[PDB]
Design a protein around this ligand. Structure first.
Ligand SMILES: *[C@@H]1O[C@H](CO)[C@@H](O[C@@H]2O[C@H](CO)[C@@H](O[C@@H]3O[C@H](CO[C@H]4O[C@H](CO[C@H]5O[C@H](CO)[C@@H](O)[C@H](O)[C@@H]5O)[C@@H](O)[C@H](O[C@H]5O[C@H](CO)[C@@H](O)[C@H](O)[C@@H]5O)[C@@H]4O)[C@@H](O)[C@H](O[C@H]4O[C@H](CO)[C@@H](O)[C@H](O)[C@@H]4O)[C@@H]3O)[C@H](O)[C@H]2NC(C)=O)[C@H](O)[C@H]1NC(C)=O
Ligand SMILES: *[C@@H]1O[C@H](CO)[C@@H](O[C@@H]2O[C@H](CO)[C@@H](O[C@@H]3O[C@H](CO[C@H]4O[C@H](CO)[C@@H](O)[C@H](O[C@H]5O[C@H](CO)[C@@H](O)[C@H](O)[C@@H]5O)[C@@H]4O)[C@@H](O)[C@H](O[C@H]4O[C@H](CO)[C@@H](O)[C@H](O)[C@@H]4O)[C@@H]3O)[C@H](O)[C@H]2NC(C)=O)[C@H](O)[C@H]1NC(C)=O
Ligand SMILES: *[C@@H]1O[C@H](CO)[C@@H](O[C@@H]2O[C@H](CO)[C@@H](O[C@@H]3O[C@H](CO)[C@@H](O)[C@H](O[C@H]4O[C@H](CO)[C@@H](O)[C@H](O)[C@@H]4O)[C@@H]3O)[C@H](O)[C@H]2NC(C)=O)[C@H](O)[C@H]1NC(C)=O
Ligand SMILES: *[C@@H]1O[C@H](CO)[C@@H](O[C@@H]2O[C@H](CO)[C@@H](O[C@@H]3O[C@H](CO)[C@@H](O)[C@H](O)[C@@H]3O)[C@H](O)[C@H]2NC(C)=O)[C@H](O)[C@H]1NC(C)=O
Ligand SMILES: *[C@@H]1O[C@H](CO)[C@@H](O[C@@H]2O[C@H](CO)[C@@H](O[C@@H]3O[C@H](CO)[C@@H](O)[C@H](O)[C@@H]3O)[C@H](O)[C@H]2NC(C)=O)[C@H](O)[C@H]1NC(C)=O
Ligand SMILES: CC(=O)N[C@@H]1[C@@H](O)[C@H](O)[C@@H](CO)O[C@H]1O
Ligand SMILES: *[C@@H]1O[C@H](CO)[C@@H](O)[C@H](O)[C@H]1NC(C)=O
Ligand SMILES: *[C@@H]1O[C@H](CO)[C@@H](O)[C@H](O)[C@H]1NC(C)=O
Ligand SMILES: [Ca+2]
Ligand SMILES: [Ca+2]
Ligand SMILES: [Ca+2]
Ligand SMILES: [Ca+2]
Ligand SMILES: [Ca+2]
Ligand SMILES: [Ca+2]
Ligand SMILES: [Mg+2]
Lengths: 8, 435, 450
């Protein structure tokens, strides 16, 4: 997934 | 029925302001027995036929007088202010209203010209693996620039995000460690000057090896705030009047003016330095700068930007390039491995091209450029403002033409190649009356 | 051009309260017209609330003191239900300090909507700092007041509606339906939410923080490629779907690689009808939007502001001036490309940061438009331009130019950052304009004449 500042 | 006659010049001064090919007669007996005085002003060739000798035809013409023409540097140690890459440096153009004045502009790319490079890096969590290979960027880039110049200074800065909601979590815990428990992320921060420009590349490596990665929430980061500070904070970064390269290394988009409103930041960027202990302090007070603002402050401070971004965000920063003069875009890898070669390629493209810009001109005054580059390619219109594919030691020329219609007093504007401090001072005087 | 620009009435709020950040007409009847003024940095009597923000009611007939604060919420920050006993420590569940209440102000009939886009809470579970935003709805002329925080849901944090900031923009329909913009939902994809005053009331239940209005209309989450779009940054209403139910105009300023776009949603089932794209990167196309018929043909026309639009001067110098785009509606639909464009002349003036319809200012059978450049003028105090509607849309030249009469202090006035027109408060048969200027905590009202 990895959205925002590298939030998997 | 030319324009000169159909303007009824009441005096000599009026005849000049109306048409460049006009002349005023002052010899009696010229007038036919029933002429109006609105006839002494007429086409220069027409007055000679109607019966008006040259002695009695006043016709002031604009002249061109160079005032400073220091020659371009040649082979037979020199400080960068003794080096000349453009000439002349000052001249006077007397402008007949309607007539254009033209003068040549020589540009020659200096050899072994010094370079200052500042590396501004994204230390957000998404740039974790990247920081691992910059351990040796210092010495390795120092070694590679030896080929380019015998005088190279390097610096390092970092950035993350505005330190306010909603761009970061505001809980006391996440303020201490914005990442998960597994990571040991440092607290979020806007911008810090890790190292000012220097020649000791050994310092570069040790300092970068002491930086901890940080973190925040939204994907796009606040690099523009940092770009602004690096641009305007002149003496704290240590910019010399030479080639100035800003490497902007990120793996995500960018915040810009308008986004501050989410966090209650309505006040626009002021374009002023605000460093306390090499920390940007006013990220919570001033909005992100707009692109147009950065264009202004990057140009006046002669910064040449190299965007070193990942494959994913190439199209975004490619459009940013099109809006920023004297900048380049390269594809950064995952571990920032090809960064050195990325920087060299970017440099060689920026240095092989010169672009001229001029200051504000008064109404009536207009300008146009005619470029003459290597191999006979000749630009005109907007292409006249630039020449590309310029090697070291190569010379190129520009024929600049200035025209005036109105009749203001003594105006003045500068012409300057982008990236360099050297400029050409054009002083204007207006011929409004007869001599 | 008939606005009494030489003698406007000025209102003054508390210093540093951003009085005039939001403005609005209020009329719970033909008699008793008033001016509403938001001041999102005003201190309040709420216990333990630093600068909660407040909305001011300013009845017409100034003497002695016009403006007074509307008490939407006298209570401070509520406490965590499952932590009053605990071990040691009484935790607040919500945070009303610095919530910017009154950032947005809208009214319809005897109803008033006021929003706090920076209100945040913790949730009754894991400790967070989610700025869900909140709104307070006053109805039947203050006889009852309701909180409405449709982003304060079961879906917390950025991945959900935690950073929605519901109320960042807002508007009433001509029937009184509430429409909210929340640019932070689903990792800043943005969101539009909407419910009737009835639905909000028939489900109101203060005991449980997470309220769920039945029948609420709202855009849904999309794939992550749409993150960071800021849908709901700005909002307007008008009829574009060929019925009698007004539709939702919404700015998406950072959508499509930051070229931005505006979208129009079907007012009945909030589904997409139109899309209009910006022409330059990061011009903030969609910063402000508005809807009104500017050529007297019965069909509402679209207006969009891009205050960071950069352009080139004749001598080859770039400059941030801003620009406004106007799309005219026809029976067949709306053309994807603008019909005309208006461009600012002052560098960094942010032309097009605010827009409002004025109604027919000169009674010439054509509605007119006011456009604000909050940093225009020789002293950068701010400017408002009035453009006249006509047979072929808005005129190229402005009919009037409103500038503040007071001198420039050491901070910007933001004159023209907040506008509101199309209402005749004095009743002279000519519409009136309310210009905000929160920079010096003032709000100006201009008055038309025959
Ligand atoms: C929608 O809701 C809003 C808000 O709820 C509502 O607006 C309120 O309407 C009520 C009407 O019921 C208003 O209440 C009245 O206010 C009258 C004016 O009060 C001010 O002026 C007083 C002096 O008036 C004299 O002088 C003027 C000239 O200056 C002259 O024309 C008058 O005729 C009169 O001779 C002044 O004393 C008063 O100050 C007192 O009150 C305030 C507030 O309580 C207090 O802070 C002060 O310390 C001081 O005690 C104020 O400055 C007022 O005259 C009137 O009084 C009579 O009625 C009360 C009812 O209890 C009696 O007790 C009293 O003895 C009098 O007989 C009454 O109080 C109220 O002010 C409005 N508020 C706002 C914010 O607008 C709308 O009407 C609603 N709309 C609809 C459609 O429902
Ligand atoms: C104006 O411009 C905007 C923005 O460009 C346009 O909006 C976008 O339109 C496209 C095209 O319609 C949207 O993509 C599609 O979305 C629909 C609807 O998805 C919803 O409904 C599904 C069915 O009920 C449901 O499954 C979805 O839920 C899934 O997806 C979410 C997303 O994260 C996920 O979280 C869930 O867990 C689910 O996995 C969702 O509720 C969808 O049906 C489409 O799918 C088709 O196409 C894909 C390939 O693209 C294919 O794989 C599928 O099998 C199916 O065939 C498609 O995803 C997009 O979401 C819109 N974006 C926004 C921000 O609104 C708008 O259309 C333009 N208007 C006009 C008038 O032009
Ligand atoms: C996201 O934003 C981008 C940027 O705006 C957008 O792509 C752009 O689309 C427009 C038109 O849709 C392009 O503009 C055209 O440019 C060409 C030259 O490249 C011109 O010839 C065009 O002039 C006319 O001719 C067309 C027919 O040939 C007409 O259909 C057109 O309407 C014009 O009247 C026109 O100016 C622009 O070049 C691109 N930009 C880029 C960078 O590609 C994109 O569509 C947006 N995405 C979405 C989903 O909307
Ligand atoms: C880089 O080069 C610039 C110039 O190319 C140097 O700055 C210049 O410094 C001189 C002073 O020696 C400034 O002169 C000033 O003139 C104004 C009137 O025009 C006067 O009011 C001032 O008191 C001063 O005498 C000149 O303006 C200034 N030019 C600038 C800032 O563009 C600078 O020192 C060089 N720096 C390095 C590191 O090489
Ligand atoms: C905007 O959204 C509304 C609601 O979704 C749309 O209204 C709906 O439009 C459809 C197609 O016109 C209607 O379909 C059908 O209705 C007829 C008669 O009512 C019935 O015989 C069919 O079996 C079918 O159900 C639907 O009824 C209608 N609903 C309402 C409440 O009006 C509207 O068309 C949309 N507008 C645009 C421009 O997209
Ligand atoms: C005052 C004056 O210069 N008058 C001259 C005259 O001397 C000359 O002979 C004549 C010939 O065209 O032109 C006129
Ligand atoms: C950088 O990463 C690539 C794989 O993406 C790898 O092949 C290369 O060896 C790496 N370079 C260094 C210096 O670690
Ligand atoms: C640049 O000019 C040189 C001539 O010295 C020529 O050989 C080369 O092909 C040129 N390059 C480009 C990209 O035009
Ligand atoms: Ca990385
Ligand atoms: Ca970020
Ligand atoms: Ca409709
Ligand atoms: Ca219309
Ligand atoms: Ca009109
Ligand atoms: Ca009026
Ligand atoms: Mg990041």
């Amino acid at each position: 997934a990895c959205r925002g500042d590298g939030w998997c | 029925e030319n324009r000169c006659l159909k303007a009824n010049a009441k005096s000599c001064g009026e005849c000049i302001q109306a048409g460049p090919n006009c002349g005023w007669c002052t010899n009696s007996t010229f007038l036919q027995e029933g002429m109006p005085t609105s006839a002494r002003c007429d086409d220069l060739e027409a007055l000679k036929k109607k019966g008006c000798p040259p002695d009695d035809i006043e016709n002031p013409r604009g002249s061109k007088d160079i005032k400073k023409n220091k020659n371009v540097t040649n082979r037979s140690k020199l400080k960068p202010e003794d080096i000349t890459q453009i000439q002349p440096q000052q001249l006077v153009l007397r402008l007949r209203s309607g007539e254009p004045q033209t003068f040549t502009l020589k540009f020659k790319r200096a050899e072994d010209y010094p370079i200052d490079l500042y590396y501004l890096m994204d230390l957000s969590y998404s740039m974790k693996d990247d920081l691992e290979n910059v351990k040796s960027l210092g010495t390795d880039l120092m070694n590679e620039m030896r080929r380019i110049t015998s005088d190279f200074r390097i610096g390092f800065g970092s950035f993350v995000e505005k330190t306010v909601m909603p761009y970061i979590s505001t809980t006391p815990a996440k303020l201490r460690n914005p990442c998960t428990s597994e990571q040991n992320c440092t607290t979020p921060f806007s911008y810090k000057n890790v190292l000012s420009l220097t020649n000791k590349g050994e310092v570069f490596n040790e300092l970068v090896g002491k930086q901890r990665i940080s973190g925040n929430l939204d994907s796009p980061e606040g690099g523009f705030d940092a770009i602004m500070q690096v641009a305007v904070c002149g003496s704290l970064i240590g910019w010399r009047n030479v080639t100035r390269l800003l490497v902007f290394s990120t793996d995500a988009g960018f915040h810009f003016a308008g986004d501050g409103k989410l966090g209650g930041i309505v006040l626009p960027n002021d374009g002023q330095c605000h460093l306390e202990n090499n920390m940007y302090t006013m990220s919570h007070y001033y909005d992100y700068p707009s692109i147009a603002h950065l264009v202004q402050k990057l140009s006046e401070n002669n910064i040449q930007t190299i965007f070193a971004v990942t494959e994913e965000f190439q199209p975004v920063y490619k459009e940013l390039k099109n809006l920023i003069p004297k900048s380049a875009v390269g594809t950064l890898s995952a571990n920032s491995s090809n960064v050195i070669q990325l920087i060299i390629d970017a440099y060689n493209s920026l240095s092989s091209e010169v672009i001229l810009e001029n200051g504000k001109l008064s109404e009536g005054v207009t300008i146009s450029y005619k470029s003459y580059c290597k191999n006979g390619v000749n630009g005109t219109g907007e292409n006249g403002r630039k020449c590309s594919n310029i090697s070291i030691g190569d010379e190129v020329q520009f024929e600049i033409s200035i025209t005036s219609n109105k009749c203001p007093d003594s105006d003045s504007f500068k012409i300057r190649p982008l990236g360099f401090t050297e400029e050409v001072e054009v002083i204007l005087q207006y011929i409004c009356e007869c001599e | 051009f008939n606005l009494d620009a030489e003698a406007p009435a000025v209102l003054s709020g508390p210093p540093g309260s951003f009085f005039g950040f939001s403005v609005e007409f209020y009329r719970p009847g033909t008699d008793g017209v008033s001016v509403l003024v938001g001041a999102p940095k005003a201190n309040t009597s709420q216990p333990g609330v630093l600068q909660g923000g407040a909305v001011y009611l300013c009845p017409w007939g100034a003497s002695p003191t016009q403006c007074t604060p509307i008490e939407f919420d006298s209570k401070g920050s509520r406490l965590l239900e499952s932590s009053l006993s605990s071990s040691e420590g009484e935790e607040p569940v919500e945070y009303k300090s610095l919530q910017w209440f009154g950032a947005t102000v809208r009214a319809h009939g005897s109803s008033i909507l006021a929003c706090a886009p920076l209100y945040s809470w913790r949730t009754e579970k894991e400790p967070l700092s989610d700025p869900v935003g909140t709104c307070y709805l006053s109805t039947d002329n203050f006889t009852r007041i309701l909180e409405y925080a449709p982003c304060r849901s079961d879906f917390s944090w950025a991945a959900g509606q935690g950073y929605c900031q519901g109320g960042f923009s807002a508007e009433f329909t001509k029937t009184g339906r509430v429409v909210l913009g929340g640019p932070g939902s689903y990792f800043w994809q943005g969101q539009i939410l909407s419910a009737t005053q009835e639905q909000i009331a028939e489900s109101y239940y203060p005991e449980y923080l997470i309220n769920l209005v039945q029948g609420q209309l709202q855009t849904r989450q999309a794939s992550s490629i749409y993150d960071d779009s800021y849908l709901g940054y700005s909002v307007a209403v008008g009829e574009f779907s060929g019925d009698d139910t007004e539709d939702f105009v919404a700015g998406v300023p950072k959508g499509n690689l930051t070229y931005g776009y505006v979208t129009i949603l079907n007012g009945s089932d909030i589904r997409s009808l139109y899309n209009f794209s910006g022409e330059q990167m990061a011009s903030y196309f969609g910063y402000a939007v508005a809807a009104t018929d500017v050529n007297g043909d019965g069909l509402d026309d679209l207006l969009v502001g891009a205050p960071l639009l950069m352009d080139r001067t004749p001598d080859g110098r770039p400059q941030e001036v801003g620009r406004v785009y106007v799309y005219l509606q026809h029976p067949a639909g709306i053309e994807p490309t603008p019909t005309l464009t208006l461009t600012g002349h002052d560098e960094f003036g942010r032309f097009g940061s605010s827009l409002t319809p004025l109604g027919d200012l000169d009674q010439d059978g054509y509605n007119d438009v006011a456009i604000g450049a909050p940093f225009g003028g020789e002293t950068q105090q701010g400017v408002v331009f009035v453009f006249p509607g006509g047979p072929g849309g808005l005129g190229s030249k402005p009919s009037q130019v409103l500038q503040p009469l007071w001198a420039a202090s050491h901070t910007p006035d933001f004159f023209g950052s907040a506008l509101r027109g199309g209402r005749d408060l004095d009743g002279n048969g000519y519409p009136d304009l309310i210009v905000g200027s929160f920079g010096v905590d003032k709000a100006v009202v201009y008055r038309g004449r025959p």
